[PDB]
Design an enzyme around this catalytic site. Sequence first.
Site, PDB file in Angstrom:
ATOM      1  N   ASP A 268      -6.088 -17.216 -19.851  1.00 40.12           N
ATOM      2  CA  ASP A 268      -7.512 -16.892 -19.806  1.00 40.12           C
ATOM      3  C   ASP A 268      -7.772 -15.573 -20.522  1.00 40.12           C
ATOM      4  OD1 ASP A 268     -10.151 -16.562 -19.212  1.00 40.12           O
ATOM      5  OD2 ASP A 268      -9.855 -16.131 -17.077  1.00 40.12           O
TER       6      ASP A 268
ATOM      7  N   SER B 127     -20.576 -13.024 -34.022  1.00 38.80           N
ATOM      8  CA  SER B 127     -20.683 -14.086 -35.004  1.00 38.80           C
ATOM      9  C   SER B 127     -21.858 -13.811 -35.934  1.00 38.80           C
ATOM     10  CB  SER B 127     -20.879 -15.421 -34.280  1.00 38.80           C
ATOM     11  OG  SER B 127     -21.162 -16.486 -35.165  1.00 38.80           O
TER      12      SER B 127
END
Length: 330
Positions: free
Chosen positions: A35, A199
Amino acid sequence: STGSATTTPIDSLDDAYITPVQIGTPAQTLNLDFDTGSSDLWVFSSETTASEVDGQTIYTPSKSTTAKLLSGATWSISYGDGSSSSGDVYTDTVSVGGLTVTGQAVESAKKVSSSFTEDSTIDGLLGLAFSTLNTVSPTQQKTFFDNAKASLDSPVFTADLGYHAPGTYNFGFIDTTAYTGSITYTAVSTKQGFWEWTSTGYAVGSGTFKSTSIDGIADTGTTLLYLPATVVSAYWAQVSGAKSSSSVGGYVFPCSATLPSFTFGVGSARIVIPGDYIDFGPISTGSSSCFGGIQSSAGIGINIFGDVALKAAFVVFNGATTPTLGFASK
Ligand SMILES: CCCn1c2c(c(SC(C)C)nc1=O)CCC2
């Protein structure tokens, strides 16, 4: 040193991925959920409340000659999906894919929430976010990667998750045969303890690319892709009959649909998520309404590039002095 381990979907939907991890002496192999959005290595154990164990493999520290109680240390974690676990702490030898750390903090669960009990395939979590998020008190502990880093050939790990197929976690090297083209690297902020990046935009299907900054985290422990409501609405508007269902908890779509792809930007590069990766199947057995794999982050407080996005790429978690993230197509 290096390590290399195969990671395997837990079910036919890729709801999560498990990777075998050796703990203790002699080794006890547990299948952990790696994770990159948390920083605790915790396991089901011989200390876990018996009614909260339902098929998991447990770590028994009393059977490990290298286990030592970390005196006075406790841990307690709550995850974004509302699940939780807590307990006490041992140090022990932990190996992943041939890479060994001695003295790793292994957090032994005394209590786990119902979602963990109900998933017999996940024996615990191995956190790969920054150690500043580790919950051990009163002395915070380091992640497996932080402990290994100085010994690694290169201070990196990579995630290569499969679509409905196994993939690989590598530590200490970049497998140049595992991706196509070049890896595009992008800046990371560690201020929230995550692999947080920006992004450069998105496209839906064959549509034009929209240049827009989307700050979010690369999170292997989250199944879906969570993005701003504007972006998610633009995606699902291209699927006849798709709608946001308050009763289901997000966007659903007719199982008869052919889903469009979704592209996200990494600098000037582009990662394409095929439409099929966005199908999470019927909302209940036999239903013709299907779960969508792109959901709104509104109300989470952060955008999350979970497995839906990451499995479309070869992802480098670069733990250099200034960390960065790399993405390649594959
Ligand atoms: C047993 C069903 C669990 N489940 C799953 C998904 C969602 S997506 C929803 C939040 C839009 N909600 C759920 O409750 C995706 C695949 C599995």
